[PDB]
Amino acid sequence: GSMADSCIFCKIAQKQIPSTIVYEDDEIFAFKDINPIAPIHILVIPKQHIASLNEITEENEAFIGKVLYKVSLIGKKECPEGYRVVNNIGEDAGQTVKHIHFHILGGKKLAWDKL
Amino acid sequence: GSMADSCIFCKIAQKQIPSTIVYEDDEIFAFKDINPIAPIHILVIPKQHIASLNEITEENEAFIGKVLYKVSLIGKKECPEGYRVVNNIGEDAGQTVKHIHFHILGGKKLAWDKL
Ligand SMILES: Nc1nc2c(ncn2[C@@H]2O[C@H](COP(=O)(O)O)[C@@H](O)[C@H]2O)c(=O)[nH]1
Numbered sequence: 487g488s489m490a491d492s493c494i495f496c497k498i499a500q501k502q503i504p505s506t507i508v509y510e511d512d513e514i515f516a517f518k519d520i521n522p523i524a525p526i527h528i529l530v531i532p533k534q535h536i537a538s539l540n541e542i543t544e545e546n547e548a549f550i551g552k553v554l555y556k557v558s559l560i561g562k563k564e565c566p567e568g569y570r571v572v573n574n575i576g577e578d579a580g581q582t583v584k585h586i587h588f589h590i591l592g593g594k595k596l597a598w599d600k601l
Numbered sequence: 602g603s604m605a606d607s608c609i610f611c612k613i614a615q616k617q618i619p620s621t622i623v624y625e626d627d628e629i630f631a632f633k634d635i636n637p638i639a640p641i642h643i644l645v646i647p648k649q650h651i652a653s654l655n656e657i658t659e660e661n662e663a664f665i666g667k668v669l670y671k672v673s674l675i676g677k678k679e680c681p682e683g684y685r686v687v688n689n690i691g692e693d694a695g696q697t698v699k700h701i702h703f704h705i706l707g708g709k710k711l712a713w714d715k716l
């Protein structure tokens with residue numbers, strides 16, 4: 487069946503499952519992480535379903551560039567003293583939801599610890 | 602004076618300062634992190650000098666998309682069991698070098714700890 491009917495982040499992006507919205511437009515949806523690891527922890531997703539960064543193609547690279555530009559616009563507004571962007575791909579990175587999502591982290595001097 | 606003459610990552614990208622090269626082409630340069638926080642820890646930079654993600658514009662967003670596509674090509678080769686991509690912007694994120702660089706991290710089940 488379809489991603490629209492099955493994917494948790496597709497549903498959050500269509501407001502079929504609630505979230506605390508930070509920003510949205512026709513292309514992207516940004517909302518607060520439910521289990522934050524920093525005092526500011528925002529997820530930014532495309533509304534369209536793309537499973538991970540490994541699904542970027544030479545053909546959709548421009549759109550992912552646009553998503554990253556919008557990530558920066560959100561980051562510089564919400565985190566004027568700096569922010570970290572994180573994307574997790576697959577098992578070793580702990581990727582849970584298979585709908586690409588950029589983490590925006592900030593609000594403190596963020597740790598840089600061995601992983 | 603010019604970035605080519607002053608910026609550590611511009612110089613590494615032109616091989617004016619040594620690094621352990623992972624991949625390069627006319628657009629990007631990827632090399633091993635000197636102080637790794639994971640068993641695979643690669644930095645990917647554009648050869649052109651762009652200071653941080655906050656310098657992405659609606660006009661260069663396509664090129665940054667291309668850089669991120671190439672990050673994914675490097676990640677999926679070097680880290681077939683998954684990888685994490687990190688970008689640090691400004692003080693709170695600990696951004697040291699003001700030449701945009703994507704961290705590719707992997708080679709183990711990566712921690713997800715409070716920052
Ligand atoms: N707001 C919200 N965040 C979620 C939900 N499900 C998962 N998350 C967050 O999504 C993130 C998934 O990141 P991943 O580990 O896949 O990179 C986690 O930080 C997790 O807490 C949800 O239903 N609502």
Ligand SMILES: Nc1nc2c(ncn2[C@@H]2O[C@H](COP(=O)(O)O)[C@@H](O)[C@H]2O)c(=O)[nH]1
Pocket residue numbers: 609620621632633634635636637644688689695696697698702
């Ligand atoms: N290979 C190499 N890595 C460097 C050099 N200088 C800084 N680095 C790495 O560059 C990264 C900078 O990341 P930042 O904290 O700015 O995101 C750090 O992980 C640091 O160890 C260098 O001269 N050579």
Ligand SMILES: [Zn+2]
Pocket residue numbers: 489493494495496497534535536584585
């Ligand atoms: Zn989805």
Ligand SMILES: [Zn+2]
Pocket residue numbers: 604608609610611612649650651699700
């Ligand atoms: Zn530079």
